[PDB]
Amino acid sequence: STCCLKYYEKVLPRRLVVGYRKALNCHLPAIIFVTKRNREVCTNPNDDWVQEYIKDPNLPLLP
Amino acid sequence: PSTCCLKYYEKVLPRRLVVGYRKALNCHLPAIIFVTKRNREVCTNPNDDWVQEYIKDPNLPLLP
Amino acid sequence: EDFKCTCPAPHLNNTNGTVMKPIGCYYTCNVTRCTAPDTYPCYNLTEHQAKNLTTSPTTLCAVGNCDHGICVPNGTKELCFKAP
Amino acid sequence: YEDFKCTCPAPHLNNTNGTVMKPIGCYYTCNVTRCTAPDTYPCYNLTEHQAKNLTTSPTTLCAVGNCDHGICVPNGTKELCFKAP
């Protein structure tokens, strides 16, 4: 029920991310990465690092 | 020096790709311009830490 | 400091199959006050409608776009509600 | 990497104010991709006379403006422009 208004353009180190969420019914569709400190980071779903991160089976989608 | 930047490259540029740098500071968007292996000029924010650590490198020179 | 305004913000739902739109143009990441991008779609509510907003489609929201942090209404309307 | 689409420098003119350098328009080209200046970005709005007869000397009075939807909307202020050698 949340949407993203600014994309994180840098690459997020994998050691910080524990999971991800999807916010696609938004004006700026985004993949939301959740970090170790419970920080939600908005990223562009078309970026390759975002896609290569989601393909990781140790990086789960979180309900 | 007669060029200014209108969009910053926010991602981190791998050092192995860059051959040098220029400075464009008398601009509305002051920028450090990195020159890559294929002669591409890439605009970056001068306050970013990666950009500054690249300039501190004595093996990465300012280009006339 | 690259995480200043990259956090998600709460948005409202509709019943007409359009994108989700937030209350106003301002959202907070941690302690930082952030502003929506220009032209970003939003709802412009009265103080009455904000206190009487429910999880049910009962309120008619004015739709608008963000300009300098202000939700300028565009004249169109939708039913908005908060997700449970 | 399509992230290099519009991260290239653009040609700008010099002035005599001690102010920032300003481009001839709000549109710039990197490789083959057309890029647009950020909104409100400062620029010069010149007539074709001033553009074809512009020189490296401070001789032309340019209309100064800001970028709106890729267009240099004049703000009423003026400057002396010249191309840097």
Numbering used by the authors:
A (entry chain D): 15 to 77
B (entry chain C): 14 to 77
C (entry chain B): 21 to 104
D (entry chain A): 20 to 104
The paper states:
To understand how the core of EVA‐ACA1001 defines broad‐spectrum binding, we determined the crystal structure of EVA‐ACA1001 in complex with the human chemokine CCL16 to a resolution of 2.7 Å resolution. The complex crystallized in 1:1 stoichiometry with two molecules per asymmetric unit. In both complexes, the extreme N‐ and C‐termini of both EVA‐ACA1001 and CCL16 were not clearly visible in the electron density maps, consistent with the minimal contributions of these regions to binding. EVA‐ACA1001 comprises one β‐strand forming an anti‐parallel beta sheet with the CC motif of CCL16, two antiparallel β‐sheets, and two α‐ helices. As expected, the structure contains five intramolecular disulfide bonds, four (Cys27‐Cys49, Cys45‐Cys86, Cys62‐Cys91, and Cys81‐Cys100) of which are conserved in all class A evasins, and the fifth (Cys25‐Cys54) that is unique to class A3 evasins. EVA‐ACA1001 interacts with the chemokine CC motif, the residue immediately following the CC motif (“CC + 1” residue), and a shallow groove between the N‐loop and the third β‐strand (β3). The CC motif of CCL16 interacts with EVA‐ACA1001 through four backbone‐backbone hydrogen bonds. The CC + 1 residue (Leu19) of CCL16 is located within a deep hydrophobic pocket in the core of EVA‐ACA1001. The hydrophobic pocket is defined by the side chains of Cys27, Ala29, Pro30, His31, Pro42, Tyr47, Cys49, Pro57, and Tyr60 and by the Cys25–Cys54 disulfide bond, the unique disulfide in class A3 evasins. Notably, His31, Pro42, and Tyr60 form a hydrophobic cluster at the base of the hydrophobic pocket, which differs from the equivalent region of EVA‐AAM1001 and may contribute to the broader spectrum of chemokine binding by EVA‐ACA1001 (see Discussion).
